[PDB]
Amino acid sequence: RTPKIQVYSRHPAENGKSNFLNCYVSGFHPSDIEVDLLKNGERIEKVEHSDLYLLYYTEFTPTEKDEYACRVNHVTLSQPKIVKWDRD
Amino acid sequence: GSHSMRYFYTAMSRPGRGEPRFITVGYVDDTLFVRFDSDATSPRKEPRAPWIEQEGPEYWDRETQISKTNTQCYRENLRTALRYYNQSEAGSHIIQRMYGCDVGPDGRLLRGYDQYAYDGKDYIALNEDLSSWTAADTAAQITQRKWEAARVAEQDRAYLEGLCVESLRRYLENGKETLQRADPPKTHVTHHPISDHEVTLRCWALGFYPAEITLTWQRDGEDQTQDTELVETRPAGDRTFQKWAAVVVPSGEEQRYTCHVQHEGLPKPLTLRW
Amino acid sequence: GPAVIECWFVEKRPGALLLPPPRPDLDPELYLSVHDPAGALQAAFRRYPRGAPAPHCEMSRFVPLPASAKWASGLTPAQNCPRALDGAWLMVSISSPVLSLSSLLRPQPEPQQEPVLITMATVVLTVLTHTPAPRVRLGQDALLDLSFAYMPPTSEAASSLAPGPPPFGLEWRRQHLGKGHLLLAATPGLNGQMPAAQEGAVAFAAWDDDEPWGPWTGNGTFWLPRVQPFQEGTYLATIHLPYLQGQVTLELAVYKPPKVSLMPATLARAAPGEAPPELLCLVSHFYPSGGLEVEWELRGGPGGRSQKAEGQRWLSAGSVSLSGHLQPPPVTTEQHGARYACRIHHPSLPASGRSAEVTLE
C-alpha cells in the first residue's frame, strides 16, 4: 500500500502572516513511517504526528521566496517522496 | 448478537533498515485489546483494553511466544516468497494476514476467516465450509497446494470449535456494554473544492472490520455507476477497514446522488447523505 | 505453439517440455518429451500462438489425494489406490494470456535413451482453458471455456467389469474479493447428492463422444447468469477423477470510462493587469496515488504548449479525486482572451492522462 499524502493548510494562506502546514498521510502499513519536513530543502524540526496513517502538522509563516515540502519515506518507497508546498 | 474476534499479522521486508519487521494486533468489537511490534523495546503482547487486563498470564506469555514464533516463520515465508516471486532484495514487499472467528446471535460460530494479502493484491483465503481454499495465481497456487497437503482448513475448523468460542464468550463476559462485534462502518462525507461551480463529494465508510460491503450510489432512484469511483476496501493501518465512493458532480446534482451501504454489521443496507 | 517449453522445478531447477537439440547439463530426469494418446496437449499447443513470448511454466510432483469433499464419496467408494497408478507423478502448470494448462504425467525410472539423451513421459490428465481473462458487459450472462482429457490406464482392462469412460467432477470456486466461497461442484454421471446452486450458475460438462477404449476428451464450459461487478476478480476451476484432481486459475475485470469536469468553464472579463481568479482541475476516478504527474500551462501566448507556467500552482495526493488549483499571474499585452490548461498523468489513464482548460479574458 502506498500512502496518500495531501499537504494542505488550516486556513487560506496569505503573505506576511502565519498559518498551519499539515501533511496528511494515510492508508498503509506499518504504523511507523519516516515523515519529515523540508524548508528550502533543509530538514526542519517541529513535525507532529497523531495519537493512537493520520495527520502530521506544524505551524509556519508563509512568505514569497521561501519554500516548504513534505518528505515521506515508507518501506514501499524505494526512495523518499517529496510533496511540494501548495497554498491555493 | 453476531460477534467476531480478529487477530491481524503483518510482515514486511526492510533491507538497509534492519530485518523484516513484524506487527500483530487483536480486535474484539471496535476495541483493540492487544498490540505487538517487532520494533519495540520489549515486543510483548501489551495490554490495551480495560477488560483484557484480567486474563491469566499464561495466555499473555503464550501469545507473545506465538507472536515471536510467527515473526520467525513469516520471515521465512517472506524469504520463500521473495525466492520464487522474481523480485529483488533491494526493494521491499509487504505481506499481511487476518484470521479470526465469526459467530451468530447466540455465539454459535458462523465461520472463520484466515486470509492473506500481498502488496495490496489479495493472496489466499479459507472458505466457509472449512474444507477448501481460494487462491489468486500460480505462486498462491503453490502455497494452496502446500496447505492443501497440510489441512490448515480442518486445523482452524477444530480450533474455532474449541478455542475461539471460549475466548469470544469470555471477552463478552469482560464487557457487556456492547453486543456489536461484526463491525458496521462509521461514515461521513468529504467535500473537495471545484470552487463555486462544482464539487467533489465522497461518501466515506471506515472503522468496520470485514471487507465485502456493497457500496452503491443512486440518483433519485436510478443507479448511476459510470461517474463514481468505487475503489477497493483499503484498511486504515490500525485495522479499522475503510472505503469510500466519490463523484465530481456540478454544484447542484449532488443531492440526487445518495450513498448506499449493504453490510451485515449494519442491520440493513442503509441510505447515506452526510 | 513454441517448439520447446522451458520451465522451472521446485516442490529452483531448470527443465523443458517437448510437445532433438543436445542438452547435456539439464538433468535427464528433468527434460521431458511428452507423449499424447488423446492429442489434447499436442493439438492444443498446435492451436496455440506459435512464437509467443515465454509464458509462466512450473513443474512439481503429486500423489493421488482424494477430494476432501464428503459428497465426493461415490467416485471413491473404496480407500485403495489403483495398481496402474504407481511410479512417479508429475504436475505441470502453465499460464498465458491465451490458454492455461494443468497436466499430469508418469515418466520412467531410467532416462537412458539410445538415440539422444532425453526422457519420455505420458499425459494421464490434461486441463486446458482458452478464456484466461474474459471481460463481460454489465447486465449479461457470462460464458467460460474449460476443456479436459482423461486417458484410461493403458493396462487395466482385464478386471474392470464396468468398462468405458468413468464419471468425473467439475468444481468452480469463485468471487467475493476479500473472502471466498464455492459456486459450482457437480460430478455428472453418478447417482449422488449434489450441493446447492449459488446465484444459479451451471456448466456444460460432459464427454465429446463415448468411444469405449480409446482416449477421451471432455468439455466443461462454465456459465454464470447476469453478473455484477461485486463478483469481479478471480476464480478457480478444478476437474476431478478418482483420486485425481487438476486445477487452473481464471481472472475477470470490468470496464467503465471516466468523464471530465473543469471549472470555471466560462466566465466574463478580467481587466488588463490583473491576475485571473483561482482556477481548478478535478478528475472522477483514478487510483491509487503513485506516479501521478501534474502540469500547469499557459495556453494563449508565445512558447507553444509546453511552458513552465508563471504564477502559483497547487497539486496534492481510499484514493484521490484530486483537486488541483492554480493562481495565474497578471496578464500582459499578449494574452487577451487567453486560456490556462491543466494536465494530470495517472497510470490508469492513457499516456496523456486527462486535460482540462479554463478560458480567460
Author numbering:
A (entry chain B): 3 to 54, 63 to 98
B (entry chain A): 1 to 274
C (entry chain D): 1 to 11, 20 to 27, 34 to 331, 338 to 381
Paper excerpt:
Loading of MHC-I molecules with peptide by the catalytic chaperone tapasin in the peptide loading complex plays a critical role in antigen presentation and immune recognition. Tapasin, a key component of the PLC, is a 48 kDa transmembrane glycoprotein that bridges the TAP transporter and MHC-I to facilitate peptide loading. Movements of the membrane proximal Ig-like domains of tapasin, HLA-B*44:05, and β2-microglobulin accompany the transition to a peptide-receptive state. Together this ensemble of crystal structures provides insights into a distinct mechanism of tapasin-mediated peptide exchange.
Here, we describe a crystal structure of a tapasin–HLA-B*44:05–β2m complex (determined at 3.1 Å resolution) as well as structures of tapasin complexed with Fab fragments of two well-characterized monoclonal antibodies. Tapasin binds to a broad surface of the external aspect of B44:05 including the α2-1 helix, the α3 domain, and β2m. The interface buries an area of 2494 Å2, of which 1984 Å2 is contributed by the MHC-I heavy chain and 510 Å2 by β2m. Several tapasin loops interact with the MHC-I platform: that bounded by residues Glu11 and Lys20, of which amino acids 12 to 19 are not visualized in electron density; a long strand/loop that extends from residues Glu72 to Lys84; and the hairpin loop from Gln189 to His195. The second B44:05-binding loop of tapasin, Glu72 to Lys84, a structural feature unique to tapasin and absent in TAPBPR, interacts with the α2-1 helix (including side chains Gln141, Arg145, and Glu148) of B44:05. This extensive interaction with β2m is of particular interest as it may weaken the β2m-dependent scaffolding of the peptide binding domain floor and prevent the well-documented cooperativity between peptide and β2m binding. The tapasin-stabilized peptide-receptive state of HLA-B*44:05 is characterized by distortion of the peptide binding groove and destabilization of the β2-microglobulin interaction, leading to release of peptide.
